[PDB]
Design a protein around this ligand. Structure first.
Ligand code: 98T
Ligand code: 98T
Ligand code: 98T
Lengths: 291, 291, 291, 291, 291, 291
């Protein structure tokens, strides 16, 4: 820990200066999911890292999901699911559970972890002050698209009140639930949502915390791994990717095409992954830029 | 509805003018519980009334409880309670349920009901931006006081960020959960809490929505009912009151002694009770002032 | 007064909520003339109504005339008039009298009536801080137009300083006198002027207080009366109207065509007419919209 | 006009610099009466001088009277006066005439004269936005004091809204009429009033435009004239002064004792007297300081 | 000094009022060189004149040169010059001397002279907060252009931070040294620079303090002197001017064509020349306007 | 450089978080002298470190000296010194040289080094906008105190305009020259000055860049070195210190007693010493706190 000469303790800090300039006064949207939210030691480091950005004058906006904890509460409550394709149909009953688990349990832990370093985080959904709206989403079941309930994409973002909040010195911890135009609340996929917030707010970077080292073009060839890719190439390769990392990837493309400078798929198993990806050239992840 | 001559439609409005002057630019804390939150028609009217205040330039702050809905989720989850006196011991397991039911279910309905009239409500607990803190509370079991878990009173209120919020045009819908000084979240009794917010913010009025016509000194003598009372008399009469209305009453006294001009115990069974109590001399409730 | 059940006292208030939302933060120009300014009881109610709007966060701007009081001072002073058509020629002598009666008598009563409810009203003419200018107006005598002295229409409005004033929480009570480009003060017809202010300021509504129930297309067929009309129809019907209500009508059309959402011709004999027309669907008057 | 070498045109300007520093950003109250308001050439110069101060960043506040023009309108109207001592009893009838002559005639000329140089002046009385209040004043008739109607001294000044106005770049032209606490408007002596405004606003200087060269201790010994005097000496000499200059003098003492640095009694017959007194050491007037 | 009747002391002041209106709230760039900076009495008057403008609410920006004092320090240091044409080649050694003489000696005197009247002046070069940049300049030696070292014209001006400074009440005293795009500091000709600042800031007037009465078209015919000229005529006459006044003239044309209303070539031997040129019609100088 | 595992690249950054919280939004005064200003590689790192603080939202204020460069210019100019004790008498001739070397050479390098990372630094002396004043200082020659010319201590600091500057996002690079009350400029010892600025501005930390590892109580016993000390002990030990480090030490005590939390004597030979001392527990220097 300290058997490390100082002369180079100084050097690692001093090589963060370019990215401190790059990110000073800018929005950085961080999608936070996977194991980064399961292990206590990683969780506290993630929190402390949000504190870090905010004591450098960067404006983080956290967007979290919560698949597994939702399904655990549904079984605990004995709510039998219905499944079309692999998707659970989101009934009014399911929606209310998703809402109370995402907003009243998962988001609360992150808010309390970040607020140990200061009065920074505040939790919100699209319902609070109409910050964002949803629009119902059908999924393609297998050729035919069909309805799987009250799920949707982010429809509109109140960019104004959002950047009021972070300029006021606050870290928004977002739960991806939103009203539609008639007031009916839908659950939104947190990867998609994070790309939609990042684009609305003119974020400098989208950070996608995933449980993989990075994007392998030829999974699992160890050296197929890639550290940077354009949108156009990533687009043509999208249909050849593993099931779970497809949402993290179209989020990246919809954001970078949407004008975000770069989207990053990083390893949420590395402790302090965001500090590594933002202020260090030794990034585990993969960068996505337009092209 | 309209078989009412207009010449007096005009008169009822014009007699709201004194209380519009009294309340323009001021904080009004409304504790919202009882049946006012059970019946849909009353609920929508309560929401529309919060919208009303806010389109007159009054600054409402809603504080809600949720006893019955909490205990319903505990039984649904099969969490066996422990009971000292009549109090349920609030385990870490119970606390997390209280939190997710108060913040992720009950507060969400009120936020969505108010936001049908505009981007006004935002939900918060004392955890968000450290708005308020708690301090653990023992209750007197029966002579001896003893511990009944993670319950406490409101400890400190960030008056500053709170009045920033309402001046920004927002209606805070508060869930009474708060960190203590070491970050551990307690459940706070929503009547107490509402008196503590009202005092911190320099509210003009505390409104206590209860399921009774008003305070009867000699329950149930029909004419023992009283429309106004001082603190000192109400204090001496406190030990002679029904079990459930004692918390609504010491909240009133701790607020009015605390410098709030008046606390009001009103009938949440009357539709639009807050509009009646605030802009009309035909108030069902009972007013509490210092003396 | 109070033999009116409360359950419906509550209902009349709660049905003002849509127009409180419609009018919150907006300009409402009220032309104030006729009997509304002759009877003390109506006058005090008009004042209290301006106070009302301002304690709901609406921004009233009052524009008053004063034909009869001017001619009374001219006779009291023994100033013999000259008359072309039915118009009095406005000499420098007449102008100074009009000015001192409109600004130093009539406007002063309204300012003092409104200021019994608070420091709200301030009187002004177009001369103060160059708020508006005039341009001399000839009238068509009977085929030929000819000069009838220092009378004119509103030329330019300093929209900026005007909306500074009402955002500063003030109710402007305007006397319709204005400099021309060379500094010479003209009298302006207060109906015209009110339409010109309303258009300049982006008012939500123009309210024209008149001494009639509303606009009768076939005066005096009792049922020719109409509650709403477009500009285009009202235009084609303008040449068929009574002598005194023509100015109230072209003011309405020049304002609504000018982009004001609606102009209203209301009964200033009804006590609290503006409260009835603004927050109630039982409006005596007639609404004018574009078409 | 120009047969004046420039080398000294430069010198007179450059010797205004100390008083530009002294007066930059400060309030200067100017009481404006006497011949300064009767002759057109002097009047225009007075106006242009107010424009001058305001284009140097000084904050002038003009306070005018109007004895003779009031009595002319009373005779024109055939209102017979009643006289106790030499004072006219101010009936409700007289008050309304005073008000309409001061505010609707006299103040209007000054506003239009100043506004030829820019949108600067705005007229006001104590009735507008409750800027100042009056309190009824009895005068000592001759030993015994008695009532002479609705006349009073300035009671309270809304210092706040007043300095809002001049910081907003406006020159207030004040008519000395004010409500009392029950809303009844009194006429206030414009010398007194000017001392009361100056003290309330923390004026740097009070300027009293009078029709005399200055204060002669032994009128009419030509060399009894004095250019500067303390309060205490001026106090002891007050009972030995001419009838008309006593009000100009107790105004001076009540202001300078009230904390205004200096009061000045200047010759309103000199063209541009205020420019001479403020930016030149060749002042005709007499300075009053505390002592 | 005072044997000058006051009645006309008043008149000279009152004839400054139009130019006080013209210049209130505007930028006036004054290039300050020649004898105006050599004689102590003229220097103090120049300073006091900058103080003057700033206590009238004008925003002066001073730009100074310093040819002779630079060459004196080079000889004092024994730095042998190299000369192409009549130009000294500006070596890194020469540049550092120019910088320390212009910024650390010449500008310091002016700052301390102006700050005797108040905390107004602040010295700056283009290096401070990157206020302006330079671009290297070759001069035409005699037909062929060639390099004469680190000299350049003003490249870009941070108009924003510049007008922040003067609105903050400060008088910038500029030394004409600026970084290029790679950070290398060049010396800039102070006449050119002053025209470049004036254009960037939207100055009302450029004042060029020169050691001549004005521009003589046929030097030295006494009556060839001219008080006003357009750009187009001045352009065609530029190749027929004396060696030293050519830079003062193309500065004038590049500024007035650049949109500055007028450039003025004035006599810095006249004491208080800027006060004479700005607030008096007896200007020694010559005005340049577009045409 | 990169043969350093990342897992601990992450760790060194994450251990800066406490001092980022401690220093966010605070003033840090850095005295910059010694070798830190002689070697190019150290100089650029010092600059980049000031950039660092400013892209974390810390407010650095640099105070530099320049003994050796002054004496070099005096010899280059052939100015013979006069010496009382070991002190050079500071003649008007010497002062002007000190001023032009400190402000026009030394401060210019630091400004240009910092401005390679952004428009941040601005140079100033106490002469600019009267930011600080001096008061002449005699030194005790050897028992008797005597005059050694225009040298003094910092007299008063305009705290207001100073913190305006850094909140405006600027890094002040201060040259220690200041006017006295009569406008005469003195040279101030840059260690003293830095303690005086730090106290005036409520700095969080004073950083004293020195050419020693730290304070040795028993120089040169290698282990007499100390990492933290109180004021009271340091006071009693002051008379037993080496000649050159006495000024760095009484600056520390006058600042910490003056209410600065801590003063630090650090090794300006270590590259990036300020980054090490501020964001790392491996500090070479010695901390001074009150006691
Ligand atoms: C626009 O929304 C807000 O301002 C907001 C929402 C939730 C909060 O906890 C807080 I503090 C502010
Ligand atoms: C732009 O005009 C004004 O601001 C104004 C005019 C009259 C007043 O009585 C007041 I207070 C403000
Ligand atoms: C943009 O530059 C400045 O704000 C500035 C520069 C130098 C100063 O002495 C001062 I005070 C402000």
């Amino acid at each position: 820990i300290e058997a490390l000469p100082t002369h180079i303790k100084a050097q690692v800090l001093a090589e963060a200066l370019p990215w401190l300039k790059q990110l000073h006064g800018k929005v950085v949207v961080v999608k936070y999911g996977g194991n980064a939210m399961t292990d206590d030691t990683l969780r506290r480091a993630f929190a402390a890292d949000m504190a870090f950005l905010r004591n450098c004058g960067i404006h983080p906006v956290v967007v979290h999901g919560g698949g597994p904890q939702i399904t655990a509460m549904l079984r605990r409550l004995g709510i039998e699911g219905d499944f079309k394709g692999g998707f659970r149909v989101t009934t009014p009953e399911v929606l209310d559970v998703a809402r109370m688990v995402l907003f009243g349990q998962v988001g609360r832990e992150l808010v309390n972890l970040i607020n140990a370093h200061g009065p920074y985080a505040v939790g919100i959904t699209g319902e609070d002050a109409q910050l964002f709206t949803a629009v119902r989403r059908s999924v393609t079941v297998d050729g035919v698209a069909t309805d799987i309930g009250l799920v949707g994409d982010v429809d509109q973002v109140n960019t104004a009140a959002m950047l009021d909040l972070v300029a006021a010195g606050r870290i928004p911890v977002v739960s991806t639930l939103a009203p539609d135009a008639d007031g009916v609340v839908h659950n939104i996929n947190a990867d998609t949502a994070a790309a939609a917030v990042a684009e609305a707010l003119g974020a400098e970077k989208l950070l996608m915390l995933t449980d993989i080292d990075g994007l392998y073009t030829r999974w699992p060839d160890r050296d197929s791994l890639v550290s940077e890719i354009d949108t156009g190439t990533l687009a043509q390769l999208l249909p050849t990717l593993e099931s779970g990392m497809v949402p993290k990837v179209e989020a990246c493309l919809r954001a970078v095409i949407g004008g975000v400078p770069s989207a990053h798929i990083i390893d949420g198993r590395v402790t302090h992954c965001v500090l590594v990806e933002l202020f260090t050239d030794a990034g585990t992840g993969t960068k996505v830029v337009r092209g």
